[PDB]
């Protein structure tokens, strides 16, 4: 009994197509992703294969303006158009709190949504009653498939679920529910959920009954063979895992950002045991045409985004100095603002627990391409920011040796002189240059925030120590001569859309007062 399984995860509401590095689409001809594109390839498969399932494992809920505007309604009324079969809940699904999930999604969503390890108490319990289910018995062909859900116990630390929701241990809560499936003549049981590639594997091992595991949360990419883009694999697809009862349990995962659609042919015996498991995550390169009838319904909704571009987000009571002659030379308040928005945005909606304490940011002047004037009415709209951050990049998280960090800060002034926008506007860092000295021996003080230290202060940077820092993708990929980052970086995860990050910070702050406060000095 062959079962073709289409799976996605960590889609981060990238509804219109992106570029290879998961930023704003540039070359129309070479762009990837899209729910327009995805629909095409899913419909192709369904019109061919007889046994198909289309699953998601969460983090569908944060990322672009799309969400910032439609706040989960865009998700439902499109996932319902792709005709998904089940979905699990994510780190980011509770970013709008329970009712920013229960109202927009769980009610408006036309397909069952699972997690078994999440239980509610008190009055929320009645309200939410059976909008989120622990398992689902999803009939395919003349057979039936069980699908059991889970969600990371890390969720309360990376989201805002209120104090009425409990997050039980994945394994604990799955076992009793998988057992019930076998209690009701369901032999064929898929696990589906958002706890991270690591826990996905521990579900394989330690949960009897479970035949297949589909996960996400960790942006990890599995490929068998030659990677079809920059995506570095970290295991074969599927990833076989030796269970304790002694089964082969295939664990899968698409990258993220709705770039790759998961594709896995699973062949079963008469009694619900995995015998064969082969396939590779279908990349959505420009050679798949975007479906027209969806690209229409995209541009129908595009209009309410344009409307939001001109709406007042909040107000400044100070000039936001973003001019070349400011941010490219000395410490400008705009930089200080952005960096603060980058970090703050990260500590509410953290991607994984590895980044939930990130207090360091850097930003090249050559990404700050406009100031914002207060004189008018103090008003700040999206369009304002588009002038500041027109590159439509992202804010990515990188782990970096102090040695590497020092190097880049010397390359901040090695060729000082004219515009050369490599000068770094910092956040969670105190730096001092002495310009008299030799280019590449000018940083005289560099204190950084050590949060993995009881009460966090600025302690001088050690060249041995490893440092978890946020910065633009422009810099993670060695923009303005920063080859030393792209090379000597230890971890790199793509984050949310640059403009979207500020526009949120400003909305939730409502009044900004970004000052120049002596992060950067001379002598």
């Amino acid at each position, epitope marked *: 009994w062959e079962l073709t399984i289409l799976h996605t995860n960590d889609v981060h509401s990238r509804l219109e197509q992106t570029s290879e590095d998961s930023s704003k689409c540039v070359n129309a001809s070479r762009c990837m992703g899209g729910v327009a594109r995805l629909f095409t390839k899913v419909q192709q498969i369904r019109r061919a294969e007889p046994n198909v399932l289309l699953l998601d494992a969460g983090d569908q809920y944060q990322g672009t303006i799309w969400f910032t505007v439609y706040k989960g309604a865009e998700v439902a009324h499109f996932m319902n158009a792709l005709r998904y079969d089940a979905m699990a809940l994510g780190n980011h699904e509770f970013d709008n709190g329970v009712e920013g999930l229960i109202e927009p999604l769980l009610k408006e969503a036309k397909f069952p949504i699972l997690s078994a390890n999440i239980k509610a108490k008190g009055p929320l*319990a*009645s*309200q939410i009653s059976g909008l989120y289910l622990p398992y689902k018995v999803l009939p395919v062909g003349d057979e039936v498939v069980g699908i059991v859900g889970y969600t990371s116990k890390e969720t309360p630390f990376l989201s805002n679920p209120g104090t009425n929701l409990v997050f039980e241990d994945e394994i604990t809560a799955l076992q009793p529910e998988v*057992d*019930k499936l076998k209690t009701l003549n369901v032999n064929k049981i898929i696990a589906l959920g958002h706890s991270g590639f690591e826990m996905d594997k521990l579900i394989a091992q330690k949960v009897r009954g479970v035949d297949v595991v589909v996960g996400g949360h960790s942006n990890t990419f599995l490929y068998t063979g030659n990677p079809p883009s920059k995506e570095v694999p970290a295991g074969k697809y599927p990833f076989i895992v030796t269970s304790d009862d002694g089964r082969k349990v295939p664990v899968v995962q698409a990258y993220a950002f709705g770039k790759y659609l998961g594709y896995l042919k699973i062949e079963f015996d008469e009694r619900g045991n995995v015998i064969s498991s082969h396939g590779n995550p279908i990349l959505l390169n420009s050679s798949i045409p975007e479906d027209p009838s969806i690209k229409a319904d995209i541009n129908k909704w595009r209009i309410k985004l344009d409307n939001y571009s001109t709406q007042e987000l909040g107000k400044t009571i100070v000039y936001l100095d973003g001019s070349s002659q400011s941010c490219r030379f000395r410490e400008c308040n705009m930089g200080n603002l952005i960096c603060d928005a980058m970090i703050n945005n990260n500590l509410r909606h953290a991607d994984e627990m590895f980044w939930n304490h990130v207090s360091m940011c850097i930003l090249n002047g050559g990404g700050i391409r406009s100031p914002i004037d207060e004189r008018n009415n103090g008003t700040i709209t999206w369009e304002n920011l588009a002038a500041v951050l027109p590159f439509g990049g992202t804010f990515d998280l990188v782990q970096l040796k102090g040695s590497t960090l020092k190097k880049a800060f010397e390359h901040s002034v090695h060729r000082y002189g004219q515009s050369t926008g490599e000068f770094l506007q910092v956040g969670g860092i105190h730096v001092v240059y002495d310009l008299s000295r030799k280019p590449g021996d000018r940083v005289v003080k560099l204190d950084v925030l050590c949060t993995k230290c009881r009460v966090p202060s600025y302690d001088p940077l050690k060249m041995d120590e490893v440092y978890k820092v946020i910065l633009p993708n422009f810099l993670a990929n060695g923009g303005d001569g920063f080859q030393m980052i792209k090379d000597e970086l230890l971890r790199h995860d793509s984050g949310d859309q640059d403009i979207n990050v500020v526009s949120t910070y400003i909305s939730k702050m409502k009044v900004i007062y970004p000052a120049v406060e002596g992060r950067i000095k001379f002598s």
Partner: antibody
Framework: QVQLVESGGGVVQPGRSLRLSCAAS????????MHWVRQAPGKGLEWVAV????????YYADSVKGRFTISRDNSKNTLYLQMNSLSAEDTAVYYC????????????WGQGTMVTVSS | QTVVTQEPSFSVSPGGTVTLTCGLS?????????PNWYQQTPGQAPRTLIY???TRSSGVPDRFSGSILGNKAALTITGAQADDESDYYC??????????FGGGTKLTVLG
């Protein structure tokens, strides 16, 4: 293998309290929902009450709101229903049925027990 | 309160097709009410037939096949046996704990 038996059986005069038990066996009692459903002889089925998996959640029908009290004992794999302030419209057959955590469903049903309340 | 209204009685020829419907006094019935059908031999414990609206339960014959017709949840019996002469209860869960039965449809198949 799996079944549900109930206790109650008798006849009672209007007003008096009456307790109902439902002895379960042959499954992870610990896991499933547990309901009460009544059926007035000849008439249709009516939903009474429900107890979920963990305890926190108990719900009753508008018809027996706070007139009836449901209690689960997983220590003893048995479900209970406290029926205070009885009348003639409570005269019916009283089944306990298990629910899998699915659509909060109803796969297995008990033999049922008879509740006759008259002068 | 809201009444779940399902046909009061039906008759079918053996080896025939018949559909029981099950509707809601105020509003439509969708999948997201989790329809659910039961077979009761008059005076006996009601056995399950179909939950989810579509899904057959353990060891339910394939002849029984649930659906939704416009406003109402439905149950199609394609190829009736004499074995099927009993009472059939539809029932929906409008969440918060609220579960509500149908009046019951009495299905007759004699010859």
């Amino acid at each position: 293998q799996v079944q549900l038996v109930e206790s109650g059986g008798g006849v009672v005069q209007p007003g008096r309290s009456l307790r109902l038990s439902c002895a379960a066996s042959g499954f992870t009692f610990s896991s499933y929902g547990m309901h009460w459903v009544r059926q007035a002889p000849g008439k249709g089925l009516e939903w009474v009450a429900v107890f979920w998996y963990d305890g926190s959640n108990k719900y009753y029908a508008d018809s027996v709101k706070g007139r009836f009290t449901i209690s689960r004992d997983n220590s003893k794999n048995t479900l209970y229903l406290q029926m205070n302030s009885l009348s003639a419209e409570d005269t019916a057959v009283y089944y306990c049925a298990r629910a899998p955590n699915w659509d909060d469903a109803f796969d297995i049903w008990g033999q049922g027990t008879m509740v006759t309340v008259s002068s | 309160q809201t009444v779940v209204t399902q046909e009061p009685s039906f008759s079918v020829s053996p080896g025939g097709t018949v559909t029981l419907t099950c509707g809601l006094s105020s509003g439509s019935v969708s999948t997201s009410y989790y329809p659910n059908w039961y077979q009761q031999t008059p005076g006996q414990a009601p056995r399950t037939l179909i939950y989810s609206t579509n899904t057959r339960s353990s060891g339910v014959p394939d002849r029984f096949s649930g659906s939704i017709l416009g406003n109402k949840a439905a149950l199609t019996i394609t190829g009736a046996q004499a074995d099927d002469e009993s009472d059939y209860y539809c029932v929906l869960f409008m969440g918060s704990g609220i579960w509500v039965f149908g009046g019951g449809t009495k299905l007759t198949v004699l010859g």
